[PDB]
Amino acid sequence: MIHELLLALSGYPGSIFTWNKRSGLQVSQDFPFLHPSETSVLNRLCRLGTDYIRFTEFIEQYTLHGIYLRAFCTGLDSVLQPYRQALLDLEQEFLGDPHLSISHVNYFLDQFQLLFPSVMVVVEQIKSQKIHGCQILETVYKHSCGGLPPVRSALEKILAVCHGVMYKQLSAWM
Amino acid sequence: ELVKDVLNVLIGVVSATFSLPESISSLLSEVAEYGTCYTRLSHFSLQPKGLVFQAFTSGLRRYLQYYRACVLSTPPTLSLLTIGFLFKKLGRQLRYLAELCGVAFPTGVKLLSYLYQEALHNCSNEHYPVLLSLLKTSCEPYTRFIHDWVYSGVFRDAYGEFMIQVKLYWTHGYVVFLKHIAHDIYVCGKTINLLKLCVLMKRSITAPLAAHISL
Amino acid sequence: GQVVFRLQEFIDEVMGPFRTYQAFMWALYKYFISFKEELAEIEK
Structure with a gap:
């Protein structure tokens, strides 16, 4: 279920890792090939994946309309890249050593555990208040004063791309 | 190894599991359905009605070969998950090209202007160069027609893609691009056809x- | 365990704009990752 886990973390659930459109990723039931008090960490690890899918389900649908919103989407694709990069790194590890345990990935994947919940609610405000127009430039900036250095440096990048639209329309007009 | 199977779907050739744990099927479908549009393009842009539609059809094959060039180049045999991630930032763009074409479809000026409004609609995003390189060659023959009334004056028509068709002598009926030059081209030609x-x-x-108009 | 379970309950009640507690846990959270690595290594 090692390789089964990584695929579930990429957006492809299975039988052992069921999917729900309401709750999200979750362990189905008890299995005899897993420790009785181990299912805990997997559910906590699955919460990292549940955020990831709702990203893609939002990205693919692009849903509200406007260039600033659409360009904010592509800006969201850049920040998720190290998550794609770091997860792929584990593949080289287990192919090398096949006896690794489930504890190591949690020790490796702690940094992304904190970045998503702060940036995920930023998407929720947009889908719940219909933030249409240039006002998206402030909702990203209002959370840009956050305390977490990584969360600050992440939304910093989206702002560096979201302004890429304003500067163009500003230039072609002024 | 299955990698030579998945990689041979973007080309169109069928495989042992591509006809025409157990969760891999869901992962397989995400790269599978990418292939279904690649084949759905060669079936649509194979011919060499309208002249401007041919150039746009001739410009599309100038792109797919690059998509065929990028594949079969980098990976001899890579990890299965690497394929899905590598062909994501590029694969979704392939599915966008299905919204553009059918897989009805305008022709003549109606198409050369429809493709233009697809630029401003999605300008700043990563779809700017690909659409531009199409528009840059989907208007190539139409400029030649425009390059007649300006230099030679021999009006050239085939099926009516031109917006203008053919005592008083001034009955060349006439009735997007800036109208500041639209009506001027209509008169910049009739003068040459009158001096002839x-x-x-x-x-x-x-x-x-x-x-050249002022001269 | 009580010392580490209570702290984990504290960090949980901040993730799920005080700018100080939120800035305080990030220091606590940073210490735990490094501490966790030593415990994880032993398991190897």
Whole structure:
């Protein structure tokens, strides 16, 4: 279920890792090939994946309309890249050593555990208040004063791309 | 190894599991359905009605070969998950090209202007160069028609893609691009045909043009 | 365990704009990752 886990973390659930459109990723039931008090960490690890899918389900649908919103989407694709990069790194590890345990990935994947919940609610405000127009430039900036250095440096990048639209329309007009 | 199977779907050739744990099928479908549009393009852009539609059809194959060039180049045999991630930032763009075409479809000027409004609609995103390289060659023959009334005056028509068709002598019926030059082209030609019997800034067109209209 | 379970309950009640507690846990959270690595290594 090692390789089964990584695929579930990429957006492809299975039988052992069921999917729900309401709750999200979750362990189905008890299995005899897993420790009785181990299912805990997997559910906590699955919460990292549940955020990831709702990203893609939002990205693919692009849903509200406007260039600033659409360009904010592509800006969201850049920040998720190290998550794609770091997860792929584990593949080289287990192919090398096949006896690794489930504890190591949690020790490796702690940094992304904190970045998503702060940036995920930023998407929720947009889908719940219909933030249409240039006002998206402030909702990203209002959370840009956050305390977490990584969360600050992440939304910093989206702002560096979201302004890429304003500067163009500003230039072609002024 | 299954990698030579998945990689041979973007080309169109069927495989042992591609006809025409157990969760891999869900992962397989995400790269599978990518292939279904690649084949759905060669079935649509194979011919060499309208002249401007041919060039746009001839410009599309100038792109797919690059998509065939990128594949079969980098990976001899890579990890299965690497394929899905590598062909994501590029694969989704392939599915966008299905919304553009059918897989009805305008022709003539109606198409050369429809594709233009697809630029401003999705300008700043990563779809700017690919659409531009199409529009840059989907208007190539139409400029030649425009390059007649300006230099030679021999009106050339085939099926009516031109917006203009053919005592008083002034019955060449006439009735997007800037109308500031539209009506001017209509008169910049009839003069030559009469002497014979006696950011989207369109600067690459009007600049070599207005210099010849005043003369 | 009580010392580490209570702290984990504290960090949980901040993730799920005080700018100080939120800035305080990030220091606590940073210490735990490094501490966790030593415990994880032993398991190897």
